[PDB]
Design a protein around this ligand. Structure first.
Ligand code: PAR
Ligand code: MG
Ligand code: MG
Ligand code: MG
Ligand code: MG
Ligand code: MG
Ligand code: MG
Lengths: 127, 182, 59, 142
RNA sequence: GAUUAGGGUUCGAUUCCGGAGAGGGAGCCUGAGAAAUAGCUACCACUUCUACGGAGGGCAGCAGGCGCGCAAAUUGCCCAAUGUCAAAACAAAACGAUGAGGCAGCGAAAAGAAAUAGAGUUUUCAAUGGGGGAUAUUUAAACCCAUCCAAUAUCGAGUAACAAUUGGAGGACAAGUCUGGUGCCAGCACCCGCGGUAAUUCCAGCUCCAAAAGCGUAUAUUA
């Protein structure tokens, strides 16, 4: 054993440019020996930003990772769009909400179900 | 309810549960290979029984038949791959001569005893299950892991284990905390 | 009479059993280590009587 | 002197076998409906009943004891049966007007050896298990 | 599907396909398609609100409730995925509906993998889970698992008390001519048989055997 600062190196396996939806899609595997815990998605986002030279580091989209048994590495899917305005357009709301910017959650669906059943009786401008 | 994930049984209990000849052989096999229960022997029975049954069907089939050239070269391939048969044994009549200790020698509990990484076969089963042995820089925590022939070269201590190049384990580390408060 | 048992005699012997308690006896190993303890005594430490009893009133 | 060949003699062989399977007491019990309509359990297992009274059934020769057993009346069909209470004691755990869970014992309703005319068995009294009360795992409610 | 050398013997309410039904029984309208039932009309059997004039009901949808029984869970979160509908891509003041369907809670139905210790000279040395927790990761959100006890800097086994059980020890059938008690009693025993004052069989203590996170029992059913 020899103590050194825990280094993250990052690798992209099967890369694809998607001219539809305006993005570059791929799976990204992170090797993190001597790391403590799991690498955060935010820290993978900036290091994948430098490797592809994207102008804004927040236009990278990184969702579900699966850490390998035994440790040492993770592997998840990656998305980098041509524009950040294209990111807010084509990403789902749940991946936007995990990036901060996104629509706040609707009222609980059990409430909107009951109100809509109450309005089935009415006719005028009351509903 | 609409779930189509499959599952079957891997072992079978013997007919005649009290045979004094059988009960003596299986206590030797639990001692010479460090086994938890008789059920780990009984799946090695069913693993080898299924090989002994398919290879006995293929000998009913003639040579230069399609189901014997294909799928008879598959069962000789997995014996050579997992160390069940050495490379001279290529005639398919040697699968009918395989024994239960021929399969039990290929478990990761046995090779870690035979390669020399542990003093006893009960030392090997502890060190597998306590995350010390990596087969191909892959920490394997399963004692019934059947080691291939090509995997024998690369069994070593894990790179994250305290016995390898990892951080020191619990009894040193909780002692290193007690010497720190003083 | 003809019958010597009654419903009133239910549980006669179990009530008058003298009620001995079990002793301390530290635990045996469990699981794979108990098979190690079985194997070492019946094979490594040499008809074979698995429970030979000390001599009693039969001789 | 026994059976028939003939390449076109299959209807004779099919009729011959379907009548001689009725002589099989396992085939006939599995294919007639006097089997379940007279079974005190409704073609099922473990029927509940209410304890009516306690009986001492004397053992058959060459044995000599009296077997402690209750007469219960089942709930699903109101059939009175006599059922054995297994262990040393254990009528001390049964009082009258108790609900008891009664299985058969042994031999598919054929009166296990010593006890004459008793072919059922108490498993559970007052919804607590009767062998758990004997070994004192737990005790009776109320 | 289960079992099966071969010939067979059984099970198939149940996920896919088809048929039928929506409390029983009719009869219809509308529509391309219904003899539709979270459509209508009527009667029969039950049934809820009423200010007595009247008005309604249909869980063999999903949760639940009472009964019935030997016998079967949450009045849970969500449309993120799979799809369906449709005037409908996503986004922009600006999120279509979905008890289909997922997800989680209960869940020893049944299946995989697997701890309850190792190593050495009375006496020490190492281990790493169960479990606590995170810069976090998963996830729609949590959970789980996976990864981790510094990366400058993360808690922890000793009676490892963090404690294995369930059935047996005459025979079949593996394992006591051990000790105490009772005395054809109490009970055991699938079958053969045990028990009548020296019980290889009961009630117990010890010690063994078998399977083991399992193991008895009962009823069906195949060999
Ligand atoms: N006379 C009553 C008899 O009891 C039987 O009832 C059951 C048990 O007595 C019997 O249990 C036996 C056990 O006695 C015997 N000592 C060992 C055997 N493995 C067990 O078998 C049971 O347990 C295993 C688990 O390994 C299960 O996999 C297996 O399916 C099951 N039959 O298996 C039956 C399943 O519960 C028969 N059902 C019945 O037909 C028969 O007449
Ligand atoms: Mg580790
Ligand atoms: Mg259908
Ligand atoms: Mg009617
Ligand atoms: Mg329902
Ligand atoms: Mg005695
Ligand atoms: Mg005894």
């Amino acid at each position: 054993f020899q103590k050194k600062k825990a280094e993250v190196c990052i690798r992209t396996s099967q890369f694809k440019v998607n001219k539809l939806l305006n993005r570059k899609q791929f799976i990204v595997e992170v090797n993190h020996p001597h790391w403590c815990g799991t690498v955060p998605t935010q820290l993978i986002r900036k290091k994948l930003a430098t490797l592809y030279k994207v102008p804004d580091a927040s236009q990278v989209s990184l969702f579900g990772f699966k850490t390998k048994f035994g440790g040492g590495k993770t592997t998840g899917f990656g998305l980098i769009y041509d524009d950040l305005a294209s990111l807010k357009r084509f990403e789902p709301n749940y991946r936007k909400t995990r990036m901060g910017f996104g629509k706040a959650r609707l009222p609980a669906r059990k409430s909107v179900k009951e109100r809509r059943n109450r309005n089935k009786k009415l006719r005028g401008k009351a509903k | 309810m609409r779930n189509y994930n499959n599952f079957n049984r891997v072992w079978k209990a013997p007919r005649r549960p009290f045979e004094k000849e059988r009960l003596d052989r299986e206590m030797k096999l639990c001692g010479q290979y460090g086994l938890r229960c008789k059920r780990e022997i009984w799946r090695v029975n069913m693993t080898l029984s299924k090989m002994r049954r398919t290879a006995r069907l293929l000998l009913t089939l003639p040579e230069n038949h399609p189901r014997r050239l294909l799928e008879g070269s598959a069962i000789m391939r997995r014996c050579h791959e997992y160390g069940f048969l050495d490379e001279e044994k290529d005639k398919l009549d040697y699968v009918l001569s395989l024994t239960v200790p021929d399969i039990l020698e290929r478990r990761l509990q046995t090779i870690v005893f035979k390669a020399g990484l542990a003093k006893s076969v009960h030392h090997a089963r502890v060190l597998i299950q306590q995350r010390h042995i990596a087969v191909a820089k892959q920490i394997v925590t399963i004692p019934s892991f059947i080691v291939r022939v090509s995997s024998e070269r690369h069994i070593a201590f894990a790179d994250a284990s305290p016995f390898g190049n990892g951080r020191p384990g619990r009894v040193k580390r909780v002692r290193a905390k007690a010497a720190k408060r003083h | 009479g003809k019958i010597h048992g009654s419903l009133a005699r239910a549980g006669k012997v179990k009530n008058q059993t003298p009620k001995v308690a079990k002793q301390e006896k530290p635990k045996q190993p469990r699981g794979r280590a108990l098979k190690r303890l079985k194997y070492t005594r019946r094979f490594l430490s040499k008809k074979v009587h698995m429970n030979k009893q000390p001599p009693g009133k039969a001789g | 002197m026994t059976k028939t060949n003939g390449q076109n003699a299959a209807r004779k062989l099919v009729r011959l076998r379907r009548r001689n399977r009725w002589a099989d007491k396992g085939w006939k019990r599995a294919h007639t409906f006097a089997a379940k309509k007279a079974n005190p359990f409704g073609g099922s297992s473990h029927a509940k009943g209410i304890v009516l009274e306690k009986i001492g059934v004397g053992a058959k020769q060459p044995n000599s004891a009296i077997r402690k057993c209750v007469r219960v009346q089942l709930i699903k069909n109101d059939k009175k049966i006599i059922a054995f209470v297994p262990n040393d004691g254990c009528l001390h755990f049964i009082e009258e007007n108790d609900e008891v869970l009664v299985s058969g014992f042994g031999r598919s309703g054929h009166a296990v050896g010593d006890i004459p005319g008793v072919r059922f068995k108490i498993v559970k009294v007052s919804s607590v298990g009767l062998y758990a009360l004997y070994r004192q795992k737990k005790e009776k409610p109320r």
